[PDB]
Amino acid sequence: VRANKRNEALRIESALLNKIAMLGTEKTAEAVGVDKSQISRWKRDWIPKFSMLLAVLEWGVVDDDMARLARQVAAILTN
Amino acid sequence: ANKRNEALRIESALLNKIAMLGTEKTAEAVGVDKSQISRWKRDWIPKFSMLLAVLEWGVVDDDMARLARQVAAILTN
Amino acid sequence: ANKRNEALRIESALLNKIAMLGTEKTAEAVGVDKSQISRWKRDWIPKFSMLLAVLEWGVVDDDMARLARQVAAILTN
Amino acid sequence: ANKRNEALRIESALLNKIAMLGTEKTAEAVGVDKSQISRWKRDWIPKFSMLLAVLEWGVVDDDMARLARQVAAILT
């Protein structure tokens, strides 16, 4: 299927949820630091949001953008 | 301890990418309200980074490396 | 593509930090009463912003700054 | 140094740019009455200069300058 934002976020979400479940909700929820209670608000609201962030970040940039960034940075780093 | 550093390494990579895309644009694409951007970066990214470290999620800062090179070039010529 | 953009781009950047700082000092720094500091930002910031743009004032945004440091940190090995 | 000296340092740089562009060229390119250039250099520019000092503009500029040097060093 074509690359779709909603769809990639979902894919990421499932992959994160998988890992979490393999390492155990409780074990990870603590290894991270969220009240054993918040796990629900967590799994239902942030994971999706984080997933979307990861999807957007992976969607990334194109050569033109990088080149522009390189020039802009080069300018700030010159005397 | 191992996760602490990894967490920070991941955070940096995430923060770097967000910067390469633009904080404003990224926030918009991700659905985080402009008013939350700060809370987003000082609080949530770090948390998510730890999760990613615990989950042993693969994260690389290749983009920052590439940009550093490209910049190092235009800086010499 | 011109100065109006630049002026805006600087105005934001200012407004961002003018709050990311607090209208307690922002009020002080300009010898302006705090019961008007909000109005003042409307009547002047845009002006001052155009001035800075005209003067070709070097204003770097948080993303470029970060990228610069990360790049520097890489290059300075 | 402190705020007052950082303001003055800002002010002077602003005035310098304004002098290189012409007090009247910039006067309009900005959009202020050619008569108001008076109040601007002796009233508002100082104020604005303090603000930029407080908002720490330049502290970033200094940092970037430093980095640019340290980079230029290890570079060539």
Cα separation values, D62 from A8, A63, C9, D75, Å: 42, 30, 21, 19
| Cα–Cα distance measured from residue D16 to residue C46, given in angstroms and rounded to the nearest whole number | 21
Q: How wide is the angle at C-alpha A68 spanned by C-alphas A76 and B65, nearest 5°?
A: 75
Distances (CA, A) of B6 to B9, B10, B52, C11: 5, 6, 9, 37
Q: Give residues with Cβ within 8 angstroms of D35, minimum separation 6.
A: none
D41-55 b/e with 16+ CB inside 10 Å = b? beebbbbbbbbbbbb
Q: How far apart are CA A20 and CA B52, in angstroms?
A: 10
DSSP letters for D32-75: --TTTHHHIIIIIHHHHHHHHHHTTTTHHHHHHHHHHHHHHHHH
Which token pair is B19?
A: 């910067």
Is the distance from CB of A32 to CB of A26 less than 8 angstroms? no
Can you tell me the distance from the alpha carbon of C54 to that of D26, in angstroms, rounded to the nearest whole number? 7
Give the mutation candidate from C8, C70, C75 for the B interface (greatest B CB count, under 10 A).
C70
Q: List, in order, residues 6 or more apart from A27 with CB less than 8 Å away.
A: none
CA C70 to chain centre: 22
Query: For position C28, which CATH number holds?
Result: 1.10.260.40
Q: Which domain holds residue C69?
A: 1-77
The residue to which tokens 């109006």 are assigned: C4
Q: A17 and A25 in contact (C-beta within 8 Å)?
A: no
Taking contacts as CB-CB distances below 8 angstroms, the residues of chain C near A77 are 68, 71-72
- What is the total count of domains within chain B? 1
Q: Hey, is the C-beta of D67 within 8 angstroms of any chain A C-beta?
A: yes
The answer to whether residue D74 neighbours chain A at the CB level (below 8 Å) is no
Cβ of D65 and A77 within 8 Å? no
Experimental method: X-ray
Going from the C-alpha of A20 to that of each of B9, C61, D54, D69, the distances in angstroms are: 20, 37, 46, 46
Contact B18 A57 (CB under 8 A): yes
Resolution in Å, one decimal, please.
Answer: 2.6
Q: What amino acid occupies position C3?
A: K
